């Protein structure tokens, strides 16, 4: 197994408690297959440079100004990396789900 850090560019629709339940759904996906987790860093509600996904097949008067960013530093199987980013993007939230390979051990 390899060390990964997927940063889900969370859409401003989901609240503080709704991000923490997605961290618990993350545990039932990888730890239930011979894996583990490290920790979570919540950056806070930081405004966008360009409003991405302001409206895509929705109403005309709708603008997504703000946005929250969080990186999940974990440990999982190299075959369970593709259906992981696919299980995230299927929901009406999250703009982008990019997976990264980390060589450094975070404490």
């Amino acid at each position: 197994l390899r060390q990964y850090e997927t940063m889900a560019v969370l859409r401003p629709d989901m609240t503080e408690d709704e991000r923490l339940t997605l961290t618990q759904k993350y545990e039932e996906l990888l730890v239930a297959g011979g894996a583990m987790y490290v920790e979570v860093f919540n950056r806070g509600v930081i405004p966008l440079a360009y409003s991405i996904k302001r409206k895509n097949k929705a109403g005309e008067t709708n603008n997504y100004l703000d946005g929250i960013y969080l990186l999940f530093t974990y440990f999982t199987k190299p075959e369970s990396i593709s259906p992981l980013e696919a299980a995230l993007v299927t929901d009406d939230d999250v703009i982008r789900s990019s997976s990264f390979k980390i060589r450094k051990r975070k404490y």
Binding site: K55, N56, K57, A58, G59, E60, T90
Partner: protein
């Protein structure tokens, strides 16, 4: 050709090379049309004959919802050329559905609201990101018409639009249709299958329809135009019965008029 499974081309030898089919069928058919272009009193609009038809089948609207699937094997149907497979839902509902693209091995295939977007089955546009690849849209919330020709059946969208109206038809430009509709979300039906050439007619053309060409062939009666030593008074309005081939324009309404916009005409 540019993709795999190139289209076989019969080399020279004797003009063309016909063939002789031979397969089997397992239910899923009524009788299909078998009377040739007629009406019971007047044939109307000539050009249309030759045997080799029958075999209709159904399955288009798809009322089933959140039900998994499993495309068994592929299959072809007369008239329309774009396969139709046979699939196999999780429960066991014998259907057909328009063969998407990458399948044959069963794959996923599933309809209903909130389902995996890829090329499963029915899926309401109401739940679609952009829709760069749909399939067969419906004028209403229950039918299954429009571009049913799986092969090349394309119709992009406009990401997210309100008023419940989008869809970007191909040569039909862009219009506005209800959003409370669903589709196969495949937009595929093989393009190489129709890329092939007929050959030299005879045992490939007539076996589907009577001569498509008429020509002046003189005779002012047999056709609005004609006569002369050999040449024909073309351009001088020579359409079978007041028609008008030089564009002109048709389809005029006021209330239930066309709700399509843009529609460029070069």
């Amino acid at each position: 050709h540019l993709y795999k499974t190139s289209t076989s081309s019969t080399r020279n030898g004797a003009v063309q090379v016909k063939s002789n089919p031979r397969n089997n069928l397992i239910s899923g058919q009524r009788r299909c049309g078998k009377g040739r272009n007629a009406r019971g009193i007047i044939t109307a609009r000539h050009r249309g004959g030759g045997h080799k038809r029958l075999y209709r089948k159904i399955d288009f609207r798809r009322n089933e919802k959140d039900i998994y699937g499993k495309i068994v094997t592929i299959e072809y149907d007369p008239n329309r050329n774009a396969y139709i497979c046979l699939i196999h839902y999780g429960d066991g509902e014998k259907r057909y559905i328009l063969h998407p693209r990458g399948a044959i091995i069963g794959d996923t295939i599933v309809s209903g609201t909130e389902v995996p977007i890829k090329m499963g089955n029915a899926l309401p546009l109401t739940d679609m990101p952009l829709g760069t690849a749909i399939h067969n849209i419906e004028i209403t919330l229950g039918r299954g018409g429009q571009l049913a020709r799986a092969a090349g059946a394309v119709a992009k969208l406009i990401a997210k639009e309100g008023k419940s109206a989008t869809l970007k038809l191909p040569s039909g430009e862009v219009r506005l249709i209800s959003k409370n509709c669903s589709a196969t979300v495949g937009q595929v039906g093989n393009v190489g299958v129709n890329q092939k050439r007929l050959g030299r007619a005879g045992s490939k053309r007539w076996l589907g329809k009577r001569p498509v060409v008429r020509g002046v062939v003189m005779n002012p009666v047999d056709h609005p135009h004609g006569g002369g030593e050999g040449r024909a008074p073309i351009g001088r309005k020579s359409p079978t019965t007041p028609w008008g081939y030089p564009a002109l324009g048709r389809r005029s309404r006021k209330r239930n008029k066309y709700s399509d916009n843009f529609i460029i005409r070069r």
